[PDB]
């Protein structure tokens, strides 16, 4: 029937009430099923409430290991709808730490591919960094190369080009389902566009104090207008700070530094030169004996 929406509600209403008579393994099981129903309902906030009912701590035990795995599988769904790319990433990493998944060859395959897409799908910044090397450390990741070339491109500050990166990964990773391979996941392939170009921006800012706006448009592979908009958002969110000049002469990537800071710093370079001479003098002593 079409009364599927009413059906989801009834079953949740019963089980929100804490019961003690149900075994812990049964109570936990029943909540997983409530959550499922809330996905098909499409009221996602309710699923999130149901998730927070049960504790992640309790699952750790090898008995509830099975309940543990399904619990985090469901958290993927709620997060993926709301295109909170960061949160998806986090969940996928918990799935990996499961004993079952790490040990069996086959079981890690899709999960680890997913981790790589989603790390890239969250904005670059600092948070990504502290995470990405915890993923790098892992030998199972080193086995795969289809995935590896995607993460290491994004890790290196080496410039890459969008419409060419796209082709490399078009018949492989665009065609991995529940990542980019699903229908609404096609628009997450498209969203990768934004990632690739904001990353190249982030690096280019640091290296180039000044780069001509025209040059930047060719590197980024987009019209001037789109380019103008993405610089503005990146300043707002404050990773870099920049000054753009409208006739389209220069984009001057810099955060300005005052005369007092620049002068304070000059005294220190000088202090280090004075040390350099002093050390060499002891070693002159030594060297005359050595011969």
């Amino acid at each position: 029937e079409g009364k599927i929406d009413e059906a989801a509600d009834i079953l949740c209403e019963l089980q929100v009430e804490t019961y003690g008579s149900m075994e812990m393994s049964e109570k936990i099981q029943f909540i997983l099923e409530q959550m499922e129903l809330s996905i098909l309902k499409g009221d996602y906030s309710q699923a999130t409430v149901l998730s927070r009912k049960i504790l992640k701590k309790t699952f750790k035990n090898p008995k509830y290991e099975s309940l543990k795995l399904e619990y985090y599988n469901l958290l993927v769904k709620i997060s993926l709808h709301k295109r909170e790319y960061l949160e998806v990433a986090q969940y996928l990493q918990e799935i990996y730490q499961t004993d079952a998944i790490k040990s069996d060859e086959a079981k890690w395959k899709p999960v680890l591919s997913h981790i790589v897409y989603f790390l890239v799908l969250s904005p670059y910044g600092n948070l990504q960094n502290d995470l990405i090397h915890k993923i790098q450390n892992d030998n199972n990741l080193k086995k795969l190369e289809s995935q590896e070339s995607l993460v290491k491109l994004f890790t290196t500050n080496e410039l890459m080009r969008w419409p060419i990166v796209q082709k490399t990964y078009e018949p492989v990773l665009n065609e991995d389902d529940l990542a980019f391979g699903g229908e609404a996941n096609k628009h997450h392939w498209e969203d990768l566009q934004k990632r690739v170009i904001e990353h190249n921006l982030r690096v280019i800012s640091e290296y180039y104090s000044r780069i001509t706006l025209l040059r930047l448009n060719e590197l980024l592979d987009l019209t001037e207008s789109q380019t103008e908009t993405y610089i503005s958002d990146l300043v707002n969110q404050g990773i870099i700070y920049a000054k753009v000049n409208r006739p389209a002469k220069i984009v001057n990537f810099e955060k300005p530094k005052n005369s007092s800071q620049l002068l304070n710093e000059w005294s220190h370079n000088v202090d280090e030169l004075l040390e350099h001479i002093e050390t060499i003098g002891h070693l002159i002593t030594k060297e005359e004996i050595m011969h």
Binding site: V16, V49, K53
Partner: protein, 142 residues
């Protein structure tokens, strides 16, 4: 013997308090819950011409100010209006308002919503009714 010590502090305090008049420094501000302990002739206007009374009957507007501070902390649920809280208090002071809001959000945490439900405040308000009932009174004062 130890009463006399309490008495020494007390007298020495009066002498200097009268004498602190017409300094630049604001004169001693003191707070008392009950003033039956104080003796009215000694401690008196002129030391202390401004004597502030703090009410407890309050008003519909006076309470409203308090509810706003509460409400900022965490957006009230849209289950029913902001204006609901306001109606149920009828004369109570801030102190009770605070005890109400404290219980309400505790129970909020269990459900897994950080928004305090308007039901919760309703139950918390309703309770605290005790304060020597009418049975004892009505058998010999009514």
């Amino acid at each position: 013997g130890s009463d006399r010590e309490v008495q020494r502090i007390l007298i020495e305090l009066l002498t200097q308090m009268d004498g602190f008049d017409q300094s630049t420094n604001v004169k001693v501000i003191m707070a008392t819950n009950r003033a039956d302990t104080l003796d009215p002739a000694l401690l008196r206007p002129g030391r202390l011409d401004r004597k502030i009374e703090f009410p407890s009957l309050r008003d519909r507007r006076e309470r409203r100010l308090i509810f706003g501070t509460i409400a900022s902390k965490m957006s009230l649920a849209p289950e029913a209006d902001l204006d609901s809280l306001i109606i149920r208090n009828d004369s109570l002071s801030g102190a009770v308002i605070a005890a109400i809001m404290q219980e309400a959000g505790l129970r909020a945490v269990r459900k897994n919503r950080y928004v305090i439900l308007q039901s919760d405040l309703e139950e918390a308000y309703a309770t605290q009714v005790k304060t020597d009932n009418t049975v004892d009174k009505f058998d010999f004062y009514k």
